[PDB]
Amino acid sequence: XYXXXYX
Amino acid sequence: MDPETVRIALGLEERTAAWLTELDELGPPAEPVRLPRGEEARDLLRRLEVPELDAEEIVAAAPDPDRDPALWWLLERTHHAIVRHMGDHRAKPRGGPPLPYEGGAAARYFHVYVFLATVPAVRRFHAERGIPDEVGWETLTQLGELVAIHRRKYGQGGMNMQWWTTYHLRGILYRLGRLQFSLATGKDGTPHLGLAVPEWGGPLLPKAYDESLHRARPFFDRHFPEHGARVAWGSSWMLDPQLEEYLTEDSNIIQLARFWTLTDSAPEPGNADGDSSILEFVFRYNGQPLDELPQRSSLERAVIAHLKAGRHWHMRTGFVKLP
Numbered sequence A: 001x002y003x004x005x006y007x
Numbered sequence B: 001m002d003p004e005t006v007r008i009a010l011g012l013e014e015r016t017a018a019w020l021t022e023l024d025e026l027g028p029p030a031e032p033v034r035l036p037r038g039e040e041a042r043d044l045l046r047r048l049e050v051p052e053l054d055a056e057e058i059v060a061a062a063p064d065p066d067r068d069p070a071l072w073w074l075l076e077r078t079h080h081a082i083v084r085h086m087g088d089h090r091a092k093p094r095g096g097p098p099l100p101y102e103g104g105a106a107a108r109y110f111h112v113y114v115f116l117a118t119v120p121a122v123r124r125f126h127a128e129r130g131i132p133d134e135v136g137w138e139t140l141t142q143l144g145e146l147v148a149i150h151r152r153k154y155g156q157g158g159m160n161m162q163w164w165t166t167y168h169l170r171g172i173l174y175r176l177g178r179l180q181f182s183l184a185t186g187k188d189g190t191p192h193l194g195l196a197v198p199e200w201g202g203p204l205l206p207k208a209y210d211e212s213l214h215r216a217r218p219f220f221d222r223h224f225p226e227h228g229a230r231v232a233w234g235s236s237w238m239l240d241p242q243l244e245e246y247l248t249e250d251s252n253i254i255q256l257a258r259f260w261t262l263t264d265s266a267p268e269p270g271n272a273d274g275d276s277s278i279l280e281f282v283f284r285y286n287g288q289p290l291d292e293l294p295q296r297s298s299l300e301r302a303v304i305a306h307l308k309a310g311r312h313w314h315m316r317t318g319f320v321k322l323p
């Protein structure tokens, strides 16, 4: 993880 | 300037080329990009709760179209790529890449300049939607928090959560007290409100949480009546029932998670995905060996102990009906 979103 | 020249000048990796092409084809914005300078900038930064140390640095390093042409090109188009989706929650949150720190303070604070340059457009959107000034400002103050987070995490000034600020800047997320709510839809297109918890504002007291929940429907039904959500949806390490092993009854997270109805399957024990989420939020983890991490709070000890035991934390997803 470590990235975010939300897609 | 051309996208390939920008890419090479800023030291951007080749994968960004597609983005840069999109931006090149999009072009500069109709309203030309304007950065606030000097005391105008200090006052705006202050209003946005950016700490004084960072604000002073942001103002000092503000880039210039002539000296920083590649950076400036990207600033205009990145601003444009955001405002073209004003009010549009169906578009993906693309804030653009972080700039390599070899470009200095202007590169480190790039997305702060994007945010600053975009404040007038989102505040116009706020007014058209009849959003109260204090709600609009309170929402945008998360910039200060995210700037402060970068410094704690990495040790110098910056703001590398630009994917997240696309929500504030498109006018699709609002802080309503302790909690934030975003215009969202599920996979089947049914409207809901996405819930998020800013770091700043103190503990998640039940009374504070409750007040925010009470504010959600009246706010969105007034200003976004076409939306019509009935339910809030959250995905978080905080919804992981495994926390009950380690946190006591006076834990705010434990008391509040009890209201939630989890909708995902019990995760595979070996799925290590939620680890990076809990590590980010509890420690602002940046690759340091687990032994060096602080152990002052019950949660800090819990995250590490669980990991040391060969076990994993999971992001869980659920909903609460809006009052």
Ligand SMILES: CC(C)(COP(=O)(O)OP(=O)(O)OC[C@H]1O[C@@H](n2cnc3c(N)ncnc32)[C@H](O)[C@@H]1OP(=O)(O)O)[C@@H](O)C(=O)NCCC(=O)NCCS
Pocket (backbone or CB within 6 Å): B196, B197, B198, B199, B200, B202, B203, B204, B205, B235, B236, B237, B238, B247, B250, B251, B252, B253, B254, B281, B282, B283, B296, B297, B298, B299, B300
């Ligand atoms: C949201 C937040 C304010 C909740 O704090 P809270 O209301 O104090 O939560 P609890 O009452 O459940 O805390 C239980 C214990 O864990 C500690 N704790 C809670 N959140 C913590 C965090 N992010 N980092 C370190 N310790 C934390 C508390 O200090 C408390 O310790 P104690 O038992 O030694 O007194 C806090 O976790 C936070 O700021 N997190 C960052 C934002 C975040 O996680 N957002 C959502 C991501 S999906």
Ligand SMILES: *[C@@H]1O[C@H](CO)[C@@H](O)[C@H](O)[C@H]1NC(=O)CCCCCCCCC
Pocket (backbone or CB within 6 Å): A004, B161, B164, B195, B196, B197, B198, B199, B233, B234, B235, B236, B238, B239, B252, B253, B254, B256, B257
């Ligand atoms: C996701 O990341 C951004 C940037 O780091 C943060 O600002 C958000 O706060 C994070 N999202 C998250 O907050 C989801 C929260 C769902 C909450 C579920 C209810 C909790 C009740 C205990």
Ligand SMILES: *[C@@H]1O[C@H](CO)[C@@H](O)[C@H](O)[C@H]1NC(C)=O
Pocket (backbone or CB within 6 Å): A005, A006, A007, B182, B183, B184, B185, B186, B187, B193, B194, B195, B196, B233
């Ligand atoms: C992230 O995206 C999904 C799918 O569109 C949505 O269900 C969820 O609520 C979104 N989260 C936020 C915080 O908007």
Ligand SMILES: *[C@H]1O[C@H](CO)[C@@H](O)[C@H](O)[C@@H]1O
Pocket (backbone or CB within 6 Å): A003, A007
């Ligand atoms: C989810 O997938 C999108 C594209 O589908 C990526 O941009 C994102 O980084 C994450 O992998």
